[PDB]
Amino acid sequence: VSPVIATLLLILIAVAAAVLLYTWVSGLSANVAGTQVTGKSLTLIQATWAR
Amino acid sequence: VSPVIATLLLILIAVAAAVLLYTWVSGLSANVAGTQVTGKSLTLIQATWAR
């Protein structure tokens, strides 16, 4: 009755690993920060200097 | 029967993530404000001053 018991334990193992892959994949996603785009250059109201 | 069950769970996972990509992409689009273009300079009717 060896084959019958062997097959059962193998089925359970592969199911458990697949579900674990899902959690890891989805957690991996939506895990990217990125950047902001600086606005257009600031208009120059004045440039001057003093002592 | 391991391969048969494994493959099935993997197919479902990839389908779900693809549909989620679509919603996110389309929502990302049409999400840009922009600007208006100020009209032509205002004609000067008068310039004056008082005390």
Tab-separated table of N, CA and C in Angstrom:
chain	number	residue	atom	x	y	z
A	1	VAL	N	0.845	-1.232	0.000
A	1	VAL	CA	0.000	0.000	0.000
A	1	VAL	C	0.862	1.256	0.000
A	2	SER	N	2.155	1.042	-0.217
A	2	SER	CA	3.173	2.081	-0.276
A	2	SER	C	2.813	3.232	-1.244
A	3	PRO	N	2.593	2.916	-2.541
A	3	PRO	CA	2.244	4.008	-3.455
A	3	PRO	C	1.091	4.913	-2.954
A	4	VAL	N	0.017	4.320	-2.426
A	4	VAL	CA	-1.119	5.121	-1.965
A	4	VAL	C	-0.813	6.152	-0.889
A	5	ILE	N	0.035	5.803	0.069
A	5	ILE	CA	0.390	6.720	1.130
A	5	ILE	C	1.391	7.753	0.638
A	6	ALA	N	2.327	7.316	-0.205
A	6	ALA	CA	3.360	8.197	-0.754
A	6	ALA	C	2.743	9.344	-1.552
A	7	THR	N	1.879	8.995	-2.494
A	7	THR	CA	1.225	9.997	-3.320
A	7	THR	C	0.523	11.070	-2.499
A	8	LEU	N	-0.146	10.684	-1.414
A	8	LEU	CA	-0.885	11.629	-0.566
A	8	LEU	C	-0.029	12.682	0.102
A	9	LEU	N	1.092	12.243	0.637
A	9	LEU	CA	1.973	13.185	1.263
A	9	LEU	C	2.588	14.149	0.259
A	10	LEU	N	2.823	13.684	-0.971
A	10	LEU	CA	3.420	14.522	-2.031
A	10	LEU	C	2.476	15.628	-2.510
A	11	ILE	N	1.175	15.312	-2.594
A	11	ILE	CA	0.114	16.248	-3.006
A	11	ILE	C	0.003	17.410	-2.028
A	12	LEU	N	-0.019	17.077	-0.746
A	12	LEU	CA	-0.118	18.087	0.290
A	12	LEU	C	1.054	19.069	0.253
A	13	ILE	N	2.271	18.546	0.057
A	13	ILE	CA	3.511	19.331	0.028
A	13	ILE	C	3.558	20.390	-1.063
A	14	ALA	N	3.188	19.978	-2.280
A	14	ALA	CA	3.160	20.880	-3.426
A	14	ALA	C	2.085	21.986	-3.272
A	15	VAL	N	0.940	21.666	-2.664
A	15	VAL	CA	-0.131	22.644	-2.429
A	15	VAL	C	0.320	23.743	-1.486
A	16	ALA	N	0.987	23.350	-0.396
A	16	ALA	CA	1.504	24.274	0.628
A	16	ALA	C	2.545	25.250	0.080
A	17	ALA	N	3.448	24.747	-0.759
A	17	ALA	CA	4.479	25.581	-1.355
A	17	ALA	C	3.894	26.586	-2.359
A	18	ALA	N	2.866	26.193	-3.108
A	18	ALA	CA	2.233	27.079	-4.090
A	18	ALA	C	1.561	28.271	-3.429
A	19	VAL	N	0.891	28.020	-2.313
A	19	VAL	CA	0.208	29.082	-1.586
A	19	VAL	C	1.235	30.033	-0.997
A	20	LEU	N	2.373	29.490	-0.574
A	20	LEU	CA	3.423	30.308	-0.015
A	20	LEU	C	4.025	31.193	-1.114
A	21	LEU	N	4.073	30.695	-2.350
A	21	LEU	CA	4.621	31.480	-3.465
A	21	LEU	C	3.782	32.711	-3.725
A	22	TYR	N	2.476	32.533	-3.614
A	22	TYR	CA	1.524	33.606	-3.835
A	22	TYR	C	1.723	34.767	-2.867
A	23	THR	N	1.825	34.456	-1.581
A	23	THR	CA	1.997	35.483	-0.563
A	23	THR	C	3.279	36.249	-0.806
A	24	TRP	N	4.333	35.532	-1.128
A	24	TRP	CA	5.614	36.150	-1.369
A	24	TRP	C	5.611	37.041	-2.624
A	25	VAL	N	4.961	36.579	-3.688
A	25	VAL	CA	4.910	37.332	-4.939
A	25	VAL	C	4.146	38.619	-4.756
A	26	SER	N	2.944	38.520	-4.196
A	26	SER	CA	2.109	39.698	-3.993
A	26	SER	C	2.720	40.678	-2.998
A	27	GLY	N	3.398	40.164	-1.989
A	27	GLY	CA	4.036	41.056	-1.056
A	27	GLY	C	5.162	41.758	-1.824
A	28	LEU	N	5.876	41.045	-2.707
A	28	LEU	CA	6.985	41.640	-3.478
A	28	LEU	C	6.519	42.824	-4.322
A	29	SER	N	5.321	42.695	-4.865
A	29	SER	CA	4.752	43.758	-5.666
A	29	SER	C	4.265	44.892	-4.748
A	30	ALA	N	3.994	46.063	-5.332
A	30	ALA	CA	3.510	47.231	-4.604
A	30	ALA	C	4.521	47.618	-3.533
A	31	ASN	N	5.760	47.200	-3.777
A	31	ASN	CA	6.852	47.495	-2.877
A	31	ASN	C	7.908	48.299	-3.647
A	32	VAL	N	7.467	49.274	-4.436
A	32	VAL	CA	8.391	50.139	-5.160
A	32	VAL	C	8.005	51.592	-4.880
A	33	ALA	N	8.983	52.340	-4.356
A	33	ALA	CA	8.852	53.745	-3.957
A	33	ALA	C	8.746	54.724	-5.108
A	34	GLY	N	9.824	54.849	-5.884
A	34	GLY	CA	9.820	55.776	-7.006
A	34	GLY	C	10.303	57.199	-6.707
A	35	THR	N	9.717	58.181	-7.406
A	35	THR	CA	10.105	59.588	-7.252
A	35	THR	C	9.017	60.606	-7.595
A	36	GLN	N	9.356	61.848	-7.312
A	36	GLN	CA	8.485	62.952	-7.606
A	36	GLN	C	9.241	63.682	-8.690
A	37	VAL	N	8.506	64.493	-9.442
A	37	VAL	CA	9.093	65.294	-10.499
A	37	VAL	C	9.014	66.732	-10.019
A	38	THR	N	10.203	67.313	-9.843
A	38	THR	CA	10.356	68.678	-9.377
A	38	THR	C	9.627	69.558	-10.360
A	39	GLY	N	9.030	70.605	-9.816
A	39	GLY	CA	8.276	71.514	-10.632
A	39	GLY	C	9.180	72.232	-11.569
A	40	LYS	N	8.533	73.044	-12.394
A	40	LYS	CA	9.207	73.835	-13.386
A	40	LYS	C	10.035	74.785	-12.638
A	41	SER	N	11.117	75.195	-13.279
A	41	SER	CA	12.027	76.117	-12.656
A	41	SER	C	11.316	77.331	-12.125
A	42	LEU	N	11.850	77.747	-11.000
A	42	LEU	CA	11.392	78.876	-10.236
A	42	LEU	C	11.745	80.140	-11.001
A	43	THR	N	10.777	81.041	-11.156
A	43	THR	CA	11.071	82.297	-11.838
A	43	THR	C	11.939	83.160	-10.926
A	44	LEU	N	12.852	83.892	-11.535
A	44	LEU	CA	13.785	84.713	-10.810
A	44	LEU	C	13.179	86.096	-10.593
A	45	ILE	N	12.860	86.412	-9.340
A	45	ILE	CA	12.296	87.717	-9.022
A	45	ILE	C	13.395	88.765	-8.973
A	46	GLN	N	14.585	88.396	-8.495
A	46	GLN	CA	15.719	89.319	-8.421
A	46	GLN	C	17.009	88.585	-8.106
A	47	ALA	N	18.132	89.208	-8.469
A	47	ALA	CA	19.467	88.683	-8.203
A	47	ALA	C	20.197	89.931	-7.826
A	48	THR	N	20.782	89.925	-6.643
A	48	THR	CA	21.532	91.089	-6.190
A	48	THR	C	22.588	90.773	-5.110
A	49	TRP	N	23.313	91.786	-4.650
A	49	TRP	CA	24.355	91.571	-3.666
A	49	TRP	C	24.698	92.819	-2.872
A	50	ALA	N	25.157	92.635	-1.627
A	50	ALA	CA	25.564	93.752	-0.759
A	50	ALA	C	26.825	93.415	0.059
A	51	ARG	N	27.407	94.432	0.690
A	51	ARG	CA	28.617	94.244	1.474
A	51	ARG	C	28.327	93.812	2.906
B	1	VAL	N	0.756	12.842	-8.721
B	1	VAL	CA	-0.185	13.801	-9.370
B	1	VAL	C	0.176	15.242	-9.026
B	2	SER	N	1.347	15.390	-8.419
B	2	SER	CA	1.915	16.665	-8.005
B	2	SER	C	1.941	17.717	-9.138
B	3	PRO	N	2.620	17.408	-10.265
B	3	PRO	CA	2.635	18.404	-11.340
B	3	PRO	C	1.238	18.946	-11.727
B	4	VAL	N	0.240	18.067	-11.854
B	4	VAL	CA	-1.096	18.514	-12.250
B	4	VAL	C	-1.750	19.543	-11.341
B	5	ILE	N	-1.586	19.394	-10.032
B	5	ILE	CA	-2.166	20.328	-9.090
B	5	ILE	C	-1.352	21.610	-9.032
B	6	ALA	N	-0.027	21.475	-9.106
B	6	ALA	CA	0.881	22.622	-9.056
B	6	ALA	C	0.609	23.596	-10.202
B	7	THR	N	0.591	23.068	-11.417
B	7	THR	CA	0.344	23.891	-12.588
B	7	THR	C	-0.942	24.703	-12.477
B	8	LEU	N	-2.008	24.106	-11.947
B	8	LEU	CA	-3.306	24.783	-11.819
B	8	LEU	C	-3.299	25.998	-10.917
B	9	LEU	N	-2.654	25.853	-9.777
B	9	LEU	CA	-2.577	26.969	-8.881
B	9	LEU	C	-1.737	28.103	-9.450
B	10	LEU	N	-0.713	27.770	-10.241
B	10	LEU	CA	0.178	28.782	-10.849
B	10	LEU	C	-0.526	29.613	-11.925
B	11	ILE	N	-1.399	28.966	-12.711
B	11	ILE	CA	-2.189	29.600	-13.780
B	11	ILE	C	-3.136	30.647	-13.208
B	12	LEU	N	-3.836	30.268	-12.150
B	12	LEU	CA	-4.770	31.170	-11.505
B	12	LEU	C	-4.085	32.431	-10.975
B	13	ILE	N	-2.910	32.259	-10.357
B	13	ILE	CA	-2.129	33.348	-9.756
B	13	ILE	C	-1.696	34.426	-10.738
B	14	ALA	N	-1.157	33.982	-11.877
B	14	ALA	CA	-0.711	34.891	-12.927
B	14	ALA	C	-1.891	35.662	-13.572
B	15	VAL	N	-3.055	35.023	-13.711
B	15	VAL	CA	-4.250	35.668	-14.273
B	15	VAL	C	-4.728	36.806	-13.393
B	16	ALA	N	-4.772	36.560	-12.080
B	16	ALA	CA	-5.206	37.545	-11.073
B	16	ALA	C	-4.315	38.785	-11.029
B	17	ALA	N	-3.003	38.578	-11.110
B	17	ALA	CA	-2.057	39.683	-11.094
B	17	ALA	C	-2.146	40.535	-12.369
B	18	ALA	N	-2.395	39.913	-13.520
B	18	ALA	CA	-2.507	40.639	-14.789
B	18	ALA	C	-3.702	41.579	-14.803
B	19	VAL	N	-4.820	41.112	-14.266
B	19	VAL	CA	-6.031	41.921	-14.218
B	19	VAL	C	-5.820	43.086	-13.266
B	20	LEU	N	-5.071	42.849	-12.194
B	20	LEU	CA	-4.794	43.894	-11.237
B	20	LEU	C	-3.889	44.952	-11.880
B	21	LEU	N	-2.996	44.538	-12.779
B	21	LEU	CA	-2.100	45.487	-13.453
B	21	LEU	C	-2.882	46.459	-14.308
B	22	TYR	N	-3.908	45.934	-14.959
B	22	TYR	CA	-4.762	46.722	-15.828
B	22	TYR	C	-5.463	47.852	-15.083
B	23	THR	N	-6.078	47.526	-13.952
B	23	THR	CA	-6.798	48.519	-13.166
B	23	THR	C	-5.854	49.608	-12.710
B	24	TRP	N	-4.681	49.212	-12.261
B	24	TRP	CA	-3.703	50.161	-11.786
B	24	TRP	C	-3.171	51.071	-12.908
B	25	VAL	N	-2.925	50.497	-14.081
B	25	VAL	CA	-2.399	51.261	-15.210
B	25	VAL	C	-3.400	52.287	-15.674
B	26	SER	N	-4.634	51.847	-15.914
B	26	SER	CA	-5.675	52.750	-16.386
B	26	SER	C	-6.033	53.815	-15.358
B	27	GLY	N	-5.991	53.458	-14.087
B	27	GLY	CA	-6.272	54.449	-13.080
B	27	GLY	C	-5.118	55.457	-13.127
B	28	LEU	N	-3.875	55.000	-13.329
B	28	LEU	CA	-2.708	55.900	-13.375
B	28	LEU	C	-2.846	56.952	-14.474
B	29	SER	N	-3.409	56.530	-15.592
B	29	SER	CA	-3.622	57.434	-16.703
B	29	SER	C	-4.813	58.358	-16.394
B	30	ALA	N	-4.953	59.437	-17.170
B	30	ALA	CA	-6.037	60.402	-17.016
B	30	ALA	C	-5.993	60.999	-15.617
B	31	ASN	N	-4.797	60.938	-15.036
B	31	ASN	CA	-4.567	61.477	-13.714
B	31	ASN	C	-3.489	62.566	-13.818
B	32	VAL	N	-3.592	63.419	-14.832
B	32	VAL	CA	-2.659	64.529	-14.984
B	32	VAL	C	-3.468	65.813	-15.169
B	33	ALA	N	-3.209	66.772	-14.272
B	33	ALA	CA	-3.883	68.073	-14.207
B	33	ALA	C	-3.512	69.036	-15.317
B	34	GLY	N	-2.254	69.477	-15.326
B	34	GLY	CA	-1.809	70.415	-16.347
B	34	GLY	C	-1.958	71.902	-16.007
B	35	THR	N	-2.225	72.720	-17.033
B	35	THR	CA	-2.356	74.171	-16.862
B	35	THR	C	-3.229	74.876	-17.901
B	36	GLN	N	-3.435	76.150	-17.634
B	36	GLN	CA	-4.190	76.991	-18.519
B	36	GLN	C	-3.139	77.942	-19.039
B	37	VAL	N	-3.448	78.558	-20.175
B	37	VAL	CA	-2.560	79.530	-20.782
B	37	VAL	C	-3.251	80.874	-20.626
B	38	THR	N	-2.582	81.743	-19.864
B	38	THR	CA	-3.069	83.078	-19.575
B	38	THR	C	-3.252	83.773	-20.901
B	39	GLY	N	-4.285	84.599	-20.945
B	39	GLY	CA	-4.594	85.305	-22.155
B	39	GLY	C	-3.512	86.278	-22.470
B	40	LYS	N	-3.713	86.921	-23.614
B	40	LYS	CA	-2.793	87.905	-24.117
B	40	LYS	C	-2.832	89.009	-23.153
B	41	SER	N	-1.717	89.721	-23.089
B	41	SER	CA	-1.611	90.825	-22.175
B	41	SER	C	-2.763	91.781	-22.319
B	42	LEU	N	-3.123	92.277	-21.157
B	42	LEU	CA	-4.199	93.210	-20.954
B	42	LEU	C	-3.775	94.553	-21.524
B	43	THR	N	-4.640	95.168	-22.328
B	43	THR	CA	-4.309	96.483	-22.863
B	43	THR	C	-4.392	97.509	-21.733
B	44	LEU	N	-3.505	98.484	-21.782
B	44	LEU	CA	-3.418	99.492	-20.761
B	44	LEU	C	-4.341	100.652	-21.116
B	45	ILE	N	-5.409	100.820	-20.337
B	45	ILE	CA	-6.343	101.912	-20.577
B	45	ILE	C	-5.778	103.212	-20.029
B	46	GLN	N	-5.064	103.155	-18.905
B	46	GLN	CA	-4.458	104.344	-18.301
B	46	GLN	C	-3.482	103.968	-17.203
B	47	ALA	N	-2.554	104.883	-16.917
B	47	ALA	CA	-1.563	104.724	-15.858
B	47	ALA	C	-1.525	106.105	-15.288
B	48	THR	N	-1.780	106.205	-13.998
B	48	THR	CA	-1.753	107.508	-13.344
B	48	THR	C	-1.512	107.441	-11.822
B	49	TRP	N	-1.472	108.590	-11.159
B	49	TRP	CA	-1.209	108.620	-9.733
B	49	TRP	C	-1.716	109.880	-9.055
B	50	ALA	N	-2.062	109.774	-7.766
B	50	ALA	CA	-2.534	110.921	-6.973
B	50	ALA	C	-1.975	110.900	-5.539
B	51	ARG	N	-2.146	112.007	-4.823
B	51	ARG	CA	-1.642	112.118	-3.464
B	51	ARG	C	-2.614	111.563	-2.430
